[model samples]
Every structure is written in structure tokens, then in C-alpha cells.
Target: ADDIVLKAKNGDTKFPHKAHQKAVPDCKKCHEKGPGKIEGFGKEMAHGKGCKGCHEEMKKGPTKCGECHKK
Candidate 1:
């Protein structure tokens, strides 16, 4: 599974699984609970402590509205 498409209100988030795998290289980074499914995975998490959180800290990746959420 190199890419995982995620659904959203505005648009689906085409998550780059392989890209993150290379950048992070740590499963525990996203899968804190465990691999597989993330507990309570949702928009809040994506913008809070899942995707955007890491992006914000790293000063890399998308943070703006349209940057991630496509039209």
C-alpha cells in the first residue's frame, strides 16, 4: 500500500504512504497505538496530532487549507 486515499468534506486526501515511509521511516510516529487503523482517526486528528501536527513541527508539508484539502 504505497498510497492511501482518505475521504473528507472538501476533498479526499491522497496520502503519500510511501513518501512518509521514506521521510519518517518510523511506524511508531503515526501508529502510536499500533499499525493498521488509527484509533479515532478523523479530521481533528489529521489537523491536530496526525498529519498537520507533524508537518507543523517539522515546518514541512502542507498546512494551509487548499494545500491539503483539494477542491
Candidate 2:
């Protein structure tokens, strides 16, 4: 898939899948348990460990609420 737009209460988050594919390069980092699809991918995953954690750890990408979620 290309960029995935995630629906949320705040706003729609345009997940730049293609860009991350190039930036991260290692599929497994985000995929975690092999490939195919991520089981139970939701708010906690996006806001905590999955997305935010990596961005916080790397000191890159969006961390602020309105950063990813565009109004």
C-alpha cells in the first residue's frame, strides 16, 4: 500500500508508508511478528510503542498531537 490515512477523533493521520519504507528499510521493525498484517494495530500501538516510541527513540518524525493528525 501507499500512504495510509488513519481515521481518528482528533483528525485523519496520513501515514507515509512509502516514505517510512525507504527511511526504515527493514520491514520487520514496524511489522514485528513477521509480515502480512499487524494484529491489533490501534490507538495504543500508534500512540505508544509502535509509532511514537520509535519516533521518540530516534528523535525524529512527528510526536506532537497535531503533527501526524492533520485537522
Candidate 3:
């Protein structure tokens, strides 16, 4: 699931899905609701480039590891 998902099944998956809440408020931005639901990008690489690409588009979005990791 998208860490920054618009909505989850029930609980959080710890993907930092809050930082860009306001930056990209469109669920369709990543959901692609009309395309049969994309799936599985493998761990680590899931948010590797696509996320990095999106964040670059968001002026206020996080751009570093510290914004996500704490330990």
C-alpha cells in the first residue's frame, strides 16, 4: 500500500503517508482508480524512484532519509 495513500483498508503501514497530504490531495494522483489497480513494486524500490519523482514535484515534500527514518 502507498505509505502516503489517500485511504487504507483500516490501519497505517508506516509509509510516511501524511507529508504530501496537502501537496497532492488527488487520490487519483497515485491510485489510478481507472486502470485496474497497480500492484507490487518490491520493497525499498516501491518508493525508490516514483516517490522521489513525485516529491521533487512537491515544493514542501520531504527530500531526505531523516524525514522518514528515526532509528
Candidate 4:
């Protein structure tokens, strides 16, 4: 893991890490270290792109404020 911690300035969400682990089997299955502004590149993109990508598909993910924002 990187020295940095992934945090939502607005708020935090209870991500089911264990569930994801069981479903994916490994970290590399979801993370990909690549060239991009995204932290950990390829290693961790779950918070923004990856997480939102899948959740958005299911229509259960947050699309605006109050979803992750507290104020």
C-alpha cells in the first residue's frame, strides 16, 4: 500500500472490502498501475473511476452531493 490514504474530503463510505476480496480473489484483479493522475496508478483506482464505474452500472452508486457529501 502507498503512504497515502484514500479519503473522501466530503465524507466516507463503508466499502465492503471483504466482499470485494472474496469476489476478486486478489488486489490486482481490480487495481492496475498505469500512467494517470489517479493515485497508485493501476494499483488503486477504486475510489473514483473503478468504484463509481461498476456502481454506476448497477444504478446504486452516488451521482451527486449527499451521496458522499455530509454538508
Candidate 5:
């Protein structure tokens, strides 16, 4: 599994990599440089406008704080 765990002072995010790949079926779909490549933005805007935004647009998956945060 390519589970991507991103850490932040506020909390952390666990991205379902393997499952995402099943839906996307391509590495460059999200990561043009292939994982390890970074996107511009820090904690405040990242989680919300980033992952949650996708979920918002898709109308599927969690867009809440406690949903992705482990602690």
C-alpha cells in the first residue's frame, strides 16, 4: 500500500494511496513528479483546500478535521 501520511503541528493526514491508485490508475495523476514531490502550501490551507477540496468536489469522502486526523 502507498498510504501517504502527512504530519503537521495541528494534526496529521492519512491518504489512501492504494485505493486512490485503483481509482486514478496513474502515478502522474496527482503527482506529476511522482510522490515526494511537494505542493505549495502549509497546514492551514493545505488540508482544507487540498484533500478536502477534492472530496468536496467529488461529494465523497471525509472533509472534516477529525475525519483524517489520527490524533
Candidate 6:
């Protein structure tokens, strides 16, 4: 079965359902009652806490876009 896609009005960014499911080993990792998902911003908070946290910790994340944008 094909996965459902959501479009962002800010831009036509397509959110892939199956792709995300594959990336996250477990549903509880980012859903409600999970460590990442909390009040305020819903999925945004989860992404910041989970994805951004890991990236920043590794020092390979986006600190400033201009750093690479200059190049």
C-alpha cells in the first residue's frame, strides 16, 4: 500500500509517511507519550528534541546556514 503525504503551505514540501516510518525504528520514539513529543509545537518539538539533538551532539548539524551557504 502507498503511504499518505502531507503538503506544507510554506512550500510544497512532501512529507513521506513510509520513509519516516523506516527512519524511526519505533513509533513511540516521536509520538505522544514519547520522550520527543511534548506540549507546544507538536511534531516540531519532537524534531528539535530528537533529530536536532542528535545532530547537534555530533557537531555535524546546521549551526548556521551561512556557514555552508557562503560556499
TM-score of each: 0.79, 0.80, 0.46, 0.39, 0.65, 0.37
Clashing pairs in 5: none
CA shift of 49, model 3, Å: 4.7
- The residue-by-residue lDDT of candidate 5 on 1-71, one tens digit each, is 35667886556777777667676565564665545436555565555656777678767778777887876
User: Candidate 4 has what TM-score?
Assistant: 0.39
CA lDDT of each prediction against the hidden true structure: 0.79, 0.81, 0.52, 0.53, 0.67, 0.46
Candidate 3 contains a number of clashing pairs equal to: 1
User: By lDDT, is 1 or 6 better?
Assistant: 1
lDDT of 6 at 50: 45
Best by lDDT: 2
> Candidate 4 overall Cα lDDT vs. reference?
0.53
Give the per-residue lDDT of model 3 (tens digit) for 36-55: 43554433443454465566
Q: How close is candidate 3 to the true structure, as a TM-score?
A: 0.46
Candidate 5 ranges with C-alpha deviation above 4 Å: 25-29, 33-39
Extract clashing residue pairs from model 6.
none
Q: What's model 2's TM-score? A: 0.80
Q: Tell me the deviation in Å of residue 22 in model 5.
A: 2.4
RMSD each, Å: 2.3, 2.3, 6.7, 5.7, 3.4, 6.8
Write one digit per residue (lDDT tens) for candidate 6, span 1-71: 66533333332323345755766666775565735333443336424654455446656544443321231
lDDT tens digits by residue: candidate 4, 1-71: 22333356655544556656665565774566556545453324554566655556646655564664453
Root-mean-square deviation of candidate 6: 6.8
In model 3, the worst 10-residue window by lDDT is 4-13
Which lDDT tens digits does candidate 2 get at residues 19-66? Answer: 788788778786667554466688988987678888898788899988
